[PDB]
Amino acid sequence: EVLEKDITPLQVVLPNTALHLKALLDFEDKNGDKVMAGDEWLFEGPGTYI
Amino acid sequence: PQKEVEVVEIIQATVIKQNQALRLRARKECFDREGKGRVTGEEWLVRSVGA
């Protein structure tokens, strides 16, 4: 177990900004509907992504 | 002073004399004092006298 990426702050988004969340590898989201290997969606405004 | 909160800045209330008004520009979608929905960048005017 090697620490790939060291300690870092979280990623908080401003109310009038968004994140271009692109899936790198095929996976299933928490709601579980479907995601391609290369889908792109938009993390919305005020909040914080995991 | 808590650990979960941070004081971004101190804001001195701007004095508005009579026959004067303030031009407010909203940085985000929000409401105002009266209850009018303000979108980002939409400048409005407040004519209330005082501070």
PDB file of N, CA and C in Angstrom:
ATOM      1  N   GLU A   1       0.846  -1.190   0.000  1.00  0.00           N
ATOM      2  CA  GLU A   1       0.000   0.000   0.000  1.00  0.00           C
ATOM      3  C   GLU A   1       0.883   1.242   0.000  1.00  0.00           C
ATOM      4  N   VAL A   2       0.989   1.894  -1.151  1.00  0.00           N
ATOM      5  CA  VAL A   2       1.770   3.116  -1.295  1.00  0.00           C
ATOM      6  C   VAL A   2       0.814   4.281  -1.494  1.00  0.00           C
ATOM      7  N   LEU A   3       1.086   5.387  -0.809  1.00  0.00           N
ATOM      8  CA  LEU A   3       0.234   6.570  -0.885  1.00  0.00           C
ATOM      9  C   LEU A   3       0.390   7.191  -2.266  1.00  0.00           C
ATOM     10  N   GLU A   4      -0.583   6.931  -3.143  1.00  0.00           N
ATOM     11  CA  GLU A   4      -0.506   7.416  -4.517  1.00  0.00           C
ATOM     12  C   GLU A   4      -0.469   8.938  -4.563  1.00  0.00           C
ATOM     13  N   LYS A   5      -1.395   9.588  -3.865  1.00  0.00           N
ATOM     14  CA  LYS A   5      -1.479  11.040  -3.842  1.00  0.00           C
ATOM     15  C   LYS A   5      -1.619  11.491  -2.394  1.00  0.00           C
ATOM     16  N   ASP A   6      -0.768  12.427  -1.985  1.00  0.00           N
ATOM     17  CA  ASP A   6      -0.563  12.736  -0.574  1.00  0.00           C
ATOM     18  C   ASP A   6      -1.771  13.516  -0.041  1.00  0.00           C
ATOM     19  N   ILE A   7      -1.695  13.938   1.226  1.00  0.00           N
ATOM     20  CA  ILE A   7      -2.796  14.658   1.858  1.00  0.00           C
ATOM     21  C   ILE A   7      -3.064  15.957   1.112  1.00  0.00           C
ATOM     22  N   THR A   8      -4.343  16.294   0.971  1.00  0.00           N
ATOM     23  CA  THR A   8      -4.767  17.413   0.146  1.00  0.00           C
ATOM     24  C   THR A   8      -6.117  17.906   0.641  1.00  0.00           C
ATOM     25  N   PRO A   9      -6.441  19.178   0.425  1.00  0.00           N
ATOM     26  CA  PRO A   9      -7.795  19.655   0.721  1.00  0.00           C
ATOM     27  C   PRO A   9      -8.806  19.062  -0.249  1.00  0.00           C
ATOM     28  N   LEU A  10     -10.078  19.198   0.116  1.00  0.00           N
ATOM     29  CA  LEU A  10     -11.172  18.671  -0.687  1.00  0.00           C
ATOM     30  C   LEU A  10     -11.420  19.603  -1.874  1.00  0.00           C
ATOM     31  N   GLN A  11     -12.439  19.297  -2.678  1.00  0.00           N
ATOM     32  CA  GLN A  11     -12.767  20.066  -3.879  1.00  0.00           C
ATOM     33  C   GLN A  11     -14.163  20.658  -3.702  1.00  0.00           C
ATOM     34  N   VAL A  12     -14.217  21.940  -3.351  1.00  0.00           N
ATOM     35  CA  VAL A  12     -15.470  22.668  -3.192  1.00  0.00           C
ATOM     36  C   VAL A  12     -15.669  23.560  -4.408  1.00  0.00           C
ATOM     37  N   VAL A  13     -16.918  23.689  -4.848  1.00  0.00           N
ATOM     38  CA  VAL A  13     -17.264  24.436  -6.052  1.00  0.00           C
ATOM     39  C   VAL A  13     -18.043  25.682  -5.653  1.00  0.00           C
ATOM     40  N   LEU A  14     -17.740  26.797  -6.315  1.00  0.00           N
ATOM     41  CA  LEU A  14     -18.406  28.074  -6.101  1.00  0.00           C
ATOM     42  C   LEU A  14     -19.853  27.987  -6.576  1.00  0.00           C
ATOM     43  N   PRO A  15     -20.743  28.861  -6.093  1.00  0.00           N
ATOM     44  CA  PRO A  15     -22.156  28.763  -6.503  1.00  0.00           C
ATOM     45  C   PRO A  15     -22.379  28.888  -8.002  1.00  0.00           C
ATOM     46  N   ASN A  16     -21.577  29.691  -8.696  1.00  0.00           N
ATOM     47  CA  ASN A  16     -21.746  29.931 -10.126  1.00  0.00           C
ATOM     48  C   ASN A  16     -20.643  29.271 -10.948  1.00  0.00           C
ATOM     49  N   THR A  17     -20.237  28.069 -10.557  1.00  0.00           N
ATOM     50  CA  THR A  17     -19.282  27.296 -11.335  1.00  0.00           C
ATOM     51  C   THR A  17     -19.706  25.833 -11.331  1.00  0.00           C
ATOM     52  N   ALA A  18     -19.017  25.042 -12.145  1.00  0.00           N
ATOM     53  CA  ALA A  18     -19.352  23.638 -12.325  1.00  0.00           C
ATOM     54  C   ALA A  18     -18.076  22.878 -12.652  1.00  0.00           C
ATOM     55  N   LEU A  19     -18.149  21.559 -12.521  1.00  0.00           N
ATOM     56  CA  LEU A  19     -17.008  20.688 -12.767  1.00  0.00           C
ATOM     57  C   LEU A  19     -17.297  19.767 -13.943  1.00  0.00           C
ATOM     58  N   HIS A  20     -16.337  19.656 -14.863  1.00  0.00           N
ATOM     59  CA  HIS A  20     -16.474  18.753 -16.006  1.00  0.00           C
ATOM     60  C   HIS A  20     -16.030  17.358 -15.572  1.00  0.00           C
ATOM     61  N   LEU A  21     -16.976  16.601 -15.019  1.00  0.00           N
ATOM     62  CA  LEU A  21     -16.675  15.272 -14.492  1.00  0.00           C
ATOM     63  C   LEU A  21     -16.721  14.275 -15.641  1.00  0.00           C
ATOM     64  N   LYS A  22     -15.560  13.757 -16.031  1.00  0.00           N
ATOM     65  CA  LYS A  22     -15.468  12.758 -17.087  1.00  0.00           C
ATOM     66  C   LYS A  22     -15.036  11.436 -16.471  1.00  0.00           C
ATOM     67  N   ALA A  23     -15.803  10.384 -16.735  1.00  0.00           N
ATOM     68  CA  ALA A  23     -15.402   9.057 -16.296  1.00  0.00           C
ATOM     69  C   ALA A  23     -14.210   8.581 -17.114  1.00  0.00           C
ATOM     70  N   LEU A  24     -13.172   8.116 -16.420  1.00  0.00           N
ATOM     71  CA  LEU A  24     -11.998   7.573 -17.089  1.00  0.00           C
ATOM     72  C   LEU A  24     -12.165   6.095 -17.417  1.00  0.00           C
ATOM     73  N   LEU A  25     -12.740   5.329 -16.494  1.00  0.00           N
ATOM     74  CA  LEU A  25     -12.950   3.901 -16.670  1.00  0.00           C
ATOM     75  C   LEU A  25     -14.413   3.577 -16.407  1.00  0.00           C
ATOM     76  N   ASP A  26     -14.873   2.467 -16.983  1.00  0.00           N
ATOM     77  CA  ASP A  26     -16.255   2.046 -16.800  1.00  0.00           C
ATOM     78  C   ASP A  26     -16.526   1.732 -15.334  1.00  0.00           C
ATOM     79  N   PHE A  27     -17.633   2.263 -14.823  1.00  0.00           N
ATOM     80  CA  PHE A  27     -18.028   2.048 -13.438  1.00  0.00           C
ATOM     81  C   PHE A  27     -19.504   2.386 -13.303  1.00  0.00           C
ATOM     82  N   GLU A  28     -20.060   2.072 -12.137  1.00  0.00           N
ATOM     83  CA  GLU A  28     -21.459   2.348 -11.847  1.00  0.00           C
ATOM     84  C   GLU A  28     -21.572   3.345 -10.701  1.00  0.00           C
ATOM     85  N   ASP A  29     -22.408   4.363 -10.894  1.00  0.00           N
ATOM     86  CA  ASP A  29     -22.601   5.404  -9.900  1.00  0.00           C
ATOM     87  C   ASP A  29     -23.461   4.887  -8.745  1.00  0.00           C
ATOM     88  N   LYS A  30     -23.583   5.714  -7.701  1.00  0.00           N
ATOM     89  CA  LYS A  30     -24.316   5.298  -6.508  1.00  0.00           C
ATOM     90  C   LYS A  30     -25.786   5.037  -6.817  1.00  0.00           C
ATOM     91  N   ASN A  31     -26.414   5.899  -7.620  1.00  0.00           N
ATOM     92  CA  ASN A  31     -27.782   5.638  -8.048  1.00  0.00           C
ATOM     93  C   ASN A  31     -27.876   4.425  -8.962  1.00  0.00           C
ATOM     94  N   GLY A  32     -26.807   4.105  -9.687  1.00  0.00           N
ATOM     95  CA  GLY A  32     -26.726   2.872 -10.444  1.00  0.00           C
ATOM     96  C   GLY A  32     -27.652   2.772 -11.637  1.00  0.00           C
ATOM     97  N   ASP A  33     -27.392   3.552 -12.685  1.00  0.00           N
ATOM     98  CA  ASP A  33     -28.147   3.410 -13.926  1.00  0.00           C
ATOM     99  C   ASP A  33     -27.268   2.923 -15.069  1.00  0.00           C
ATOM    100  N   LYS A  34     -26.228   3.672 -15.436  1.00  0.00           N
ATOM    101  CA  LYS A  34     -25.180   3.228 -16.352  1.00  0.00           C
ATOM    102  C   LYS A  34     -24.191   4.371 -16.541  1.00  0.00           C
ATOM    103  N   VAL A  35     -22.940   4.012 -16.829  1.00  0.00           N
ATOM    104  CA  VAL A  35     -21.891   4.968 -17.190  1.00  0.00           C
ATOM    105  C   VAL A  35     -20.971   4.294 -18.201  1.00  0.00           C
ATOM    106  N   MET A  36     -20.640   4.999 -19.283  1.00  0.00           N
ATOM    107  CA  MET A  36     -19.694   4.476 -20.263  1.00  0.00           C
ATOM    108  C   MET A  36     -18.272   4.575 -19.712  1.00  0.00           C
ATOM    109  N   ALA A  37     -17.295   4.162 -20.517  1.00  0.00           N
ATOM    110  CA  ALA A  37     -15.902   4.330 -20.123  1.00  0.00           C
ATOM    111  C   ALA A  37     -15.483   5.792 -20.218  1.00  0.00           C
ATOM    112  N   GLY A  38     -16.146   6.557 -21.084  1.00  0.00           N
ATOM    113  CA  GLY A  38     -15.759   7.936 -21.314  1.00  0.00           C
ATOM    114  C   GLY A  38     -16.888   8.947 -21.296  1.00  0.00           C
ATOM    115  N   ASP A  39     -17.912   8.716 -20.477  1.00  0.00           N
ATOM    116  CA  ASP A  39     -18.996   9.683 -20.362  1.00  0.00           C
ATOM    117  C   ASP A  39     -18.516  10.974 -19.710  1.00  0.00           C
ATOM    118  N   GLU A  40     -19.227  12.054 -20.016  1.00  0.00           N
ATOM    119  CA  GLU A  40     -18.972  13.362 -19.437  1.00  0.00           C
ATOM    120  C   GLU A  40     -20.274  13.938 -18.907  1.00  0.00           C
ATOM    121  N   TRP A  41     -20.253  14.374 -17.651  1.00  0.00           N
ATOM    122  CA  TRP A  41     -21.381  15.083 -17.069  1.00  0.00           C
ATOM    123  C   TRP A  41     -20.845  16.287 -16.305  1.00  0.00           C
ATOM    124  N   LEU A  42     -21.764  17.070 -15.752  1.00  0.00           N
ATOM    125  CA  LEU A  42     -21.438  18.353 -15.145  1.00  0.00           C
ATOM    126  C   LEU A  42     -21.833  18.323 -13.676  1.00  0.00           C
ATOM    127  N   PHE A  43     -20.837  18.322 -12.794  1.00  0.00           N
ATOM    128  CA  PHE A  43     -21.096  18.562 -11.382  1.00  0.00           C
ATOM    129  C   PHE A  43     -21.572  19.996 -11.212  1.00  0.00           C
ATOM    130  N   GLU A  44     -22.720  20.161 -10.557  1.00  0.00           N
ATOM    131  CA  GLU A  44     -23.458  21.418 -10.533  1.00  0.00           C
ATOM    132  C   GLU A  44     -22.855  22.424  -9.562  1.00  0.00           C
ATOM    133  N   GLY A  45     -23.631  23.448  -9.215  1.00  0.00           N
ATOM    134  CA  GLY A  45     -23.144  24.582  -8.468  1.00  0.00           C
ATOM    135  C   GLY A  45     -22.917  24.279  -7.001  1.00  0.00           C
ATOM    136  N   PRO A  46     -23.356  25.187  -6.127  1.00  0.00           N
ATOM    137  CA  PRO A  46     -22.889  25.180  -4.733  1.00  0.00           C
ATOM    138  C   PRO A  46     -23.011  23.815  -4.070  1.00  0.00           C
ATOM    139  N   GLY A  47     -21.877  23.306  -3.606  1.00  0.00           N
ATOM    140  CA  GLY A  47     -21.806  21.978  -3.029  1.00  0.00           C
ATOM    141  C   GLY A  47     -20.361  21.513  -2.979  1.00  0.00           C
ATOM    142  N   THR A  48     -20.197  20.202  -2.817  1.00  0.00           N
ATOM    143  CA  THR A  48     -18.868  19.607  -2.774  1.00  0.00           C
ATOM    144  C   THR A  48     -18.935  18.192  -3.327  1.00  0.00           C
ATOM    145  N   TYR A  49     -18.035  17.878  -4.252  1.00  0.00           N
ATOM    146  CA  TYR A  49     -17.963  16.551  -4.843  1.00  0.00           C
ATOM    147  C   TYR A  49     -17.036  15.652  -4.036  1.00  0.00           C
ATOM    148  N   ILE A  50     -17.338  14.358  -4.052  1.00  0.00           N
ATOM    149  CA  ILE A  50     -16.465  13.357  -3.448  1.00  0.00           C
ATOM    150  C   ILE A  50     -15.498  12.883  -4.526  1.00  0.00           C
TER     151      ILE A  50
ATOM    152  N   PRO B   1     -15.443  32.415  17.874  1.00  0.00           N
ATOM    153  CA  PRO B   1     -14.670  31.910  16.729  1.00  0.00           C
ATOM    154  C   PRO B   1     -14.590  30.391  16.746  1.00  0.00           C
ATOM    155  N   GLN B   2     -15.202  29.771  15.746  1.00  0.00           N
ATOM    156  CA  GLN B   2     -15.227  28.322  15.621  1.00  0.00           C
ATOM    157  C   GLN B   2     -14.206  27.855  14.590  1.00  0.00           C
ATOM    158  N   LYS B   3     -13.938  26.552  14.614  1.00  0.00           N
ATOM    159  CA  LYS B   3     -13.002  25.934  13.687  1.00  0.00           C
ATOM    160  C   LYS B   3     -13.635  25.602  12.345  1.00  0.00           C
ATOM    161  N   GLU B   4     -14.955  25.433  12.302  1.00  0.00           N
ATOM    162  CA  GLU B   4     -15.662  25.095  11.077  1.00  0.00           C
ATOM    163  C   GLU B   4     -16.042  26.318  10.257  1.00  0.00           C
ATOM    164  N   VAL B   5     -15.832  27.521  10.786  1.00  0.00           N
ATOM    165  CA  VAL B   5     -16.200  28.754  10.107  1.00  0.00           C
ATOM    166  C   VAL B   5     -14.957  29.616   9.956  1.00  0.00           C
ATOM    167  N   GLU B   6     -14.987  30.504   8.968  1.00  0.00           N
ATOM    168  CA  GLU B   6     -13.876  31.402   8.690  1.00  0.00           C
ATOM    169  C   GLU B   6     -14.428  32.780   8.365  1.00  0.00           C
ATOM    170  N   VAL B   7     -13.764  33.814   8.872  1.00  0.00           N
ATOM    171  CA  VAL B   7     -14.144  35.192   8.577  1.00  0.00           C
ATOM    172  C   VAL B   7     -13.436  35.624   7.294  1.00  0.00           C
ATOM    173  N   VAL B   8     -14.161  35.576   6.174  1.00  0.00           N
ATOM    174  CA  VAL B   8     -13.575  35.958   4.895  1.00  0.00           C
ATOM    175  C   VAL B   8     -13.166  37.424   4.914  1.00  0.00           C
ATOM    176  N   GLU B   9     -14.037  38.295   5.415  1.00  0.00           N
ATOM    177  CA  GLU B   9     -13.728  39.716   5.441  1.00  0.00           C
ATOM    178  C   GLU B   9     -14.619  40.426   6.449  1.00  0.00           C
ATOM    179  N   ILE B  10     -14.173  41.613   6.836  1.00  0.00           N
ATOM    180  CA  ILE B  10     -14.973  42.561   7.597  1.00  0.00           C
ATOM    181  C   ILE B  10     -15.617  43.526   6.611  1.00  0.00           C
ATOM    182  N   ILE B  11     -16.918  43.749   6.764  1.00  0.00           N
ATOM    183  CA  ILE B  11     -17.694  44.551   5.829  1.00  0.00           C
ATOM    184  C   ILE B  11     -18.267  45.730   6.599  1.00  0.00           C
ATOM    185  N   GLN B  12     -17.791  46.931   6.290  1.00  0.00           N
ATOM    186  CA  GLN B  12     -18.329  48.133   6.913  1.00  0.00           C
ATOM    187  C   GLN B  12     -19.581  48.565   6.164  1.00  0.00           C
ATOM    188  N   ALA B  13     -20.676  48.776   6.894  1.00  0.00           N
ATOM    189  CA  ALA B  13     -21.912  49.212   6.262  1.00  0.00           C
ATOM    190  C   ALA B  13     -21.699  50.552   5.573  1.00  0.00           C
ATOM    191  N   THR B  14     -22.157  50.645   4.330  1.00  0.00           N
ATOM    192  CA  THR B  14     -21.967  51.849   3.535  1.00  0.00           C
ATOM    193  C   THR B  14     -23.065  52.849   3.863  1.00  0.00           C
ATOM    194  N   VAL B  15     -22.667  54.075   4.179  1.00  0.00           N
ATOM    195  CA  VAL B  15     -23.627  55.112   4.530  1.00  0.00           C
ATOM    196  C   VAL B  15     -24.301  55.619   3.262  1.00  0.00           C
ATOM    197  N   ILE B  16     -25.628  55.598   3.261  1.00  0.00           N
ATOM    198  CA  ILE B  16     -26.428  56.116   2.161  1.00  0.00           C
ATOM    199  C   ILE B  16     -27.151  57.347   2.684  1.00  0.00           C
ATOM    200  N   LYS B  17     -26.743  58.519   2.214  1.00  0.00           N
ATOM    201  CA  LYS B  17     -27.446  59.739   2.563  1.00  0.00           C
ATOM    202  C   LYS B  17     -28.737  59.838   1.756  1.00  0.00           C
ATOM    203  N   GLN B  18     -29.632  60.712   2.203  1.00  0.00           N
ATOM    204  CA  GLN B  18     -30.833  60.983   1.428  1.00  0.00           C
ATOM    205  C   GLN B  18     -30.451  61.601   0.087  1.00  0.00           C
ATOM    206  N   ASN B  19     -31.293  61.354  -0.918  1.00  0.00           N
ATOM    207  CA  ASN B  19     -31.007  61.704  -2.310  1.00  0.00           C
ATOM    208  C   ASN B  19     -29.778  60.963  -2.828  1.00  0.00           C
ATOM    209  N   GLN B  20     -29.538  59.766  -2.299  1.00  0.00           N
ATOM    210  CA  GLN B  20     -28.462  58.907  -2.764  1.00  0.00           C
ATOM    211  C   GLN B  20     -28.952  57.468  -2.757  1.00  0.00           C
ATOM    212  N   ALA B  21     -28.241  56.617  -3.488  1.00  0.00           N
ATOM    213  CA  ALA B  21     -28.615  55.216  -3.598  1.00  0.00           C
ATOM    214  C   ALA B  21     -27.357  54.398  -3.848  1.00  0.00           C
ATOM    215  N   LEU B  22     -27.475  53.093  -3.619  1.00  0.00           N
ATOM    216  CA  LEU B  22     -26.371  52.164  -3.798  1.00  0.00           C
ATOM    217  C   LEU B  22     -26.663  51.223  -4.956  1.00  0.00           C
ATOM    218  N   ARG B  23     -25.653  51.018  -5.797  1.00  0.00           N
ATOM    219  CA  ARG B  23     -25.726  50.104  -6.934  1.00  0.00           C
ATOM    220  C   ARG B  23     -25.147  48.765  -6.491  1.00  0.00           C
ATOM    221  N   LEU B  24     -26.021  47.786  -6.284  1.00  0.00           N
ATOM    222  CA  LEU B  24     -25.606  46.465  -5.841  1.00  0.00           C
ATOM    223  C   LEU B  24     -25.567  45.498  -7.015  1.00  0.00           C
ATOM    224  N   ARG B  25     -24.490  44.717  -7.083  1.00  0.00           N
ATOM    225  CA  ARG B  25     -24.311  43.720  -8.131  1.00  0.00           C
ATOM    226  C   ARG B  25     -24.186  42.351  -7.483  1.00  0.00           C
ATOM    227  N   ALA B  26     -25.131  41.465  -7.783  1.00  0.00           N
ATOM    228  CA  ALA B  26     -25.129  40.137  -7.188  1.00  0.00           C
ATOM    229  C   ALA B  26     -24.068  39.257  -7.835  1.00  0.00           C
ATOM    230  N   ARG B  27     -23.264  38.602  -6.997  1.00  0.00           N
ATOM    231  CA  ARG B  27     -22.247  37.680  -7.483  1.00  0.00           C
ATOM    232  C   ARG B  27     -22.810  36.306  -7.815  1.00  0.00           C
ATOM    233  N   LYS B  28     -23.973  35.959  -7.267  1.00  0.00           N
ATOM    234  CA  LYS B  28     -24.601  34.670  -7.506  1.00  0.00           C
ATOM    235  C   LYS B  28     -26.114  34.837  -7.539  1.00  0.00           C
ATOM    236  N   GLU B  29     -26.790  33.848  -8.122  1.00  0.00           N
ATOM    237  CA  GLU B  29     -28.248  33.825  -8.107  1.00  0.00           C
ATOM    238  C   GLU B  29     -28.747  33.786  -6.670  1.00  0.00           C
ATOM    239  N   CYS B  30     -29.700  34.656  -6.357  1.00  0.00           N
ATOM    240  CA  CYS B  30     -30.062  34.897  -4.964  1.00  0.00           C
ATOM    241  C   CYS B  30     -31.344  35.719  -4.921  1.00  0.00           C
ATOM    242  N   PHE B  31     -31.688  36.172  -3.721  1.00  0.00           N
ATOM    243  CA  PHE B  31     -32.760  37.127  -3.490  1.00  0.00           C
ATOM    244  C   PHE B  31     -32.157  38.446  -3.013  1.00  0.00           C
ATOM    245  N   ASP B  32     -33.025  39.392  -2.665  1.00  0.00           N
ATOM    246  CA  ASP B  32     -32.600  40.684  -2.146  1.00  0.00           C
ATOM    247  C   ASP B  32     -33.385  40.998  -0.877  1.00  0.00           C
ATOM    248  N   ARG B  33     -33.213  42.225  -0.380  1.00  0.00           N
ATOM    249  CA  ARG B  33     -33.892  42.635   0.845  1.00  0.00           C
ATOM    250  C   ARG B  33     -35.405  42.638   0.663  1.00  0.00           C
ATOM    251  N   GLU B  34     -35.881  43.178  -0.458  1.00  0.00           N
ATOM    252  CA  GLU B  34     -37.313  43.274  -0.712  1.00  0.00           C
ATOM    253  C   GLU B  34     -37.943  41.952  -1.125  1.00  0.00           C
ATOM    254  N   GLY B  35     -37.197  41.073  -1.789  1.00  0.00           N
ATOM    255  CA  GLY B  35     -37.734  39.790  -2.196  1.00  0.00           C
ATOM    256  C   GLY B  35     -37.761  39.587  -3.697  1.00  0.00           C
ATOM    257  N   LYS B  36     -36.936  40.340  -4.419  1.00  0.00           N
ATOM    258  CA  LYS B  36     -36.843  40.239  -5.870  1.00  0.00           C
ATOM    259  C   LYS B  36     -35.659  39.349  -6.228  1.00  0.00           C
ATOM    260  N   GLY B  37     -35.927  38.279  -6.973  1.00  0.00           N
ATOM    261  CA  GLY B  37     -34.877  37.376  -7.402  1.00  0.00           C
ATOM    262  C   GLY B  37     -33.845  38.051  -8.281  1.00  0.00           C
ATOM    263  N   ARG B  38     -32.579  37.971  -7.886  1.00  0.00           N
ATOM    264  CA  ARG B  38     -31.481  38.602  -8.604  1.00  0.00           C
ATOM    265  C   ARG B  38     -30.578  37.521  -9.183  1.00  0.00           C
ATOM    266  N   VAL B  39     -30.393  37.554 -10.501  1.00  0.00           N
ATOM    267  CA  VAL B  39     -29.459  36.649 -11.152  1.00  0.00           C
ATOM    268  C   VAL B  39     -28.044  37.209 -11.047  1.00  0.00           C
ATOM    269  N   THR B  40     -27.069  36.368 -11.383  1.00  0.00           N
ATOM    270  CA  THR B  40     -25.670  36.767 -11.285  1.00  0.00           C
ATOM    271  C   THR B  40     -25.382  37.949 -12.202  1.00  0.00           C
ATOM    272  N   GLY B  41     -24.734  38.972 -11.645  1.00  0.00           N
ATOM    273  CA  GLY B  41     -24.327  40.132 -12.408  1.00  0.00           C
ATOM    274  C   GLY B  41     -25.403  41.167 -12.642  1.00  0.00           C
ATOM    275  N   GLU B  42     -26.653  40.882 -12.289  1.00  0.00           N
ATOM    276  CA  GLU B  42     -27.750  41.823 -12.508  1.00  0.00           C
ATOM    277  C   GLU B  42     -27.661  42.932 -11.470  1.00  0.00           C
ATOM    278  N   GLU B  43     -27.242  44.116 -11.902  1.00  0.00           N
ATOM    279  CA  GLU B  43     -27.137  45.243 -10.990  1.00  0.00           C
ATOM    280  C   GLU B  43     -28.509  45.848 -10.725  1.00  0.00           C
ATOM    281  N   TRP B  44     -28.814  46.058  -9.448  1.00  0.00           N
ATOM    282  CA  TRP B  44     -30.025  46.752  -9.038  1.00  0.00           C
ATOM    283  C   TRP B  44     -29.631  47.895  -8.115  1.00  0.00           C
ATOM    284  N   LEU B  45     -30.628  48.656  -7.671  1.00  0.00           N
ATOM    285  CA  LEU B  45     -30.394  49.864  -6.893  1.00  0.00           C
ATOM    286  C   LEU B  45     -31.219  49.821  -5.619  1.00  0.00           C
ATOM    287  N   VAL B  46     -30.605  50.217  -4.506  1.00  0.00           N
ATOM    288  CA  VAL B  46     -31.287  50.331  -3.222  1.00  0.00           C
ATOM    289  C   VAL B  46     -31.248  51.790  -2.788  1.00  0.00           C
ATOM    290  N   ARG B  47     -32.416  52.332  -2.443  1.00  0.00           N
ATOM    291  CA  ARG B  47     -32.568  53.745  -2.121  1.00  0.00           C
ATOM    292  C   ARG B  47     -32.817  53.990  -0.638  1.00  0.00           C
ATOM    293  N   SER B  48     -32.658  52.972   0.205  1.00  0.00           N
ATOM    294  CA  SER B  48     -32.921  53.126   1.630  1.00  0.00           C
ATOM    295  C   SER B  48     -31.846  54.000   2.267  1.00  0.00           C
ATOM    296  N   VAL B  49     -32.275  55.006   3.022  1.00  0.00           N
ATOM    297  CA  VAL B  49     -31.353  55.931   3.670  1.00  0.00           C
ATOM    298  C   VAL B  49     -30.883  55.339   4.992  1.00  0.00           C
ATOM    299  N   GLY B  50     -29.646  55.659   5.365  1.00  0.00           N
ATOM    300  CA  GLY B  50     -29.082  55.171   6.608  1.00  0.00           C
ATOM    301  C   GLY B  50     -27.690  54.602   6.436  1.00  0.00           C
ATOM    302  N   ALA B  51     -27.469  53.389   6.938  1.00  0.00           N
ATOM    303  CA  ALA B  51     -26.200  52.680   6.757  1.00  0.00           C
ATOM    304  C   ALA B  51     -26.546  51.283   6.250  1.00  0.00           C
TER     305      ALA B  51
END
